[PDB]
Design a protein around this ligand. Structure first.
Ligand SMILES: Oc1ccc(-c2n[nH]c3cc(O)ccc23)c(O)c1
Ligand SMILES: Oc1ccc(-c2n[nH]c3cc(O)ccc23)c(O)c1
Lengths: 243, 9, 242, 11
């Protein structure tokens, strides 16, 4: 209910202090593929735990059934991890700031087979964000749009209870749109400019989706190769995409 | 079922 | 030059470039198998590809780009472009996919092909969404051109970076065209940005479908289920899946 | 490498 009643400034505020903290890696010296992929997945794992708590704070998100919130994180999780990574790396051209103590540059992504291509994409996105001078308040909104948008079409049930579920997610997503526009109006953007930037921002979410799909395959190919012992929760998030 | 559980806590 | 065109100029341009709707080789004197099923759809895709290449060349600003960039964009976007065409045509047949006027499939027909029912289901979902948004012909053509110019753009010394500016400028027009269409239809200004976001958020979902269908096709190929035209083969080898 | 996409984008 109260999610829809929110003002533009209260949505921004809700989102800005639901923001999870930045986590730390672990401390070295030479990097094997095993040690490397072990540091990145240990990290992803801890970050998922905090994300589950961030999702719950995201307005309207807990209004959804257990099963639908489940499904939405199942679809959204690596994208969410990725946009946070690209966001944290804005201010560092050429490097991916996974953690304050784990800042890796392209050459270092050749330590792990297959992840250099994905590295480049993550770099490109960060560079694009930088190019647009993306703002923290647009970032938190982008990130909610992903949580709510990414699983919403893969709700296939044709029950009464499930249609108004989609419409609710569709109404929340409209507020978050209203807010993004509110942010750009504030920045003193013209109307044409506002529609152009909104457009630009959401087209980037298409690239983040592709990135997620690729990183998901990559992560499945390491699971097989028995390189990294992945956590149980990461295993079960990963197992959600061959279902 | 871990995700499930984590959303309840 | 694509950048000086008005919105009604832009929309006509895209409306007259539209490709034809093609017919499948369908042989109803033949039963169905994973193999005949897949032969029919990959034949169709292959022919639909040739037209696409030509449709693309009539996309304002597209011939401006270098051939390497054009090859690259098409390499990235071809299956989304086929998928959004499909979902568009199926709009008015709920629960079926109109691959071709003589090839209209429901999901139980999906069963034939290992791995397809997942993808089919997505494709129907999106069709439904289009139908529920009452998506318009004019909006479709723009959405399609947005997919061609965007999907490859992030994966690009000096001319390299001035082709980026250029795609972005053309994409800024199609957004203008989108809104102006929505203004012309009498949507409020708040409804303009809300609808605009919704059609764009669907592109994210179409990309997910292309990525899955690409993997799906690749299984088919690696399992020797259906022979693939060298063109489809090249398109597929573009995305180095494994 | 003479790619077919390449070629058709010339016809
Ligand atoms: O192919 C991939 C994609 C992502 C990760 C990854 N691992 N750890 C991460 C932490 C983040 O905040 C974001 C992404 C990651 C990875 O280890 C491999
Ligand atoms: O997993 C997939 C996804 C799409 C196709 C496909 N095959 N042929 C098509 C023709 C269209 O107009 C649109 C989609 C297709 C396919 O053969 C397999």
């Amino acid at each position: 209910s109260l999610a829809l009643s929110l003002t533009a400034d209260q949505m921004v505020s809700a989102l800005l202090d639901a923001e999870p903290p930045i986590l730390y890696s672990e401390y070295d010296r030479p990097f094997s593929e095993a040690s490397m992929m072990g540091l990145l997945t240990n990290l992803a794992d801890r970050e998922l735990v905090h994300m589950i708590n961030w999702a719950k704070r995201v307005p309207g998100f807990v209004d959804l059934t257990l099963h639908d919130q489940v499904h939405l994180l199942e679809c959204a999780w690596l994208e969410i991890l990725m946009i946070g990574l690209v966001w944290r790396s804005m201010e560092h051209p050429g490097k991916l700031l996974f953690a304050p103590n784990l800042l890796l540059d392209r050459n270092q992504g050749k330590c792990v087979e297959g992840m250099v291509e994905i590295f480049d994409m993550l770099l490109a996105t960060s560079s694009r964000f930088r190019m647009m001078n993306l703002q923290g308040e647009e970032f938190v909104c982008l990130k909610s749009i992903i949580l709510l948008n990414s699983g919403v079409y893969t709700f296939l049930s044709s029950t009464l209870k499930s249609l108004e579920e989609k419409d609710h997610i569709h109404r929340v997503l409209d507020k978050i749109t209203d807010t993004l526009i509110h942010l750009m109006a504030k920045a003193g953007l013209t109307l044409q400019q506002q529609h152009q930037r909104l457009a630009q921002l959401l087209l980037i979410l298409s690239h983040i989706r592709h990135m997620s799909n690729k990183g998901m395959e990559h992560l499945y190919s390491m699971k097989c190769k028995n390189v990294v012992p992945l956590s149980d929760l990461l295993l079960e998030m990963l197992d959600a995409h061959r279902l | 079922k871990i995700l499930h559980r984590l959303l309840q806590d």
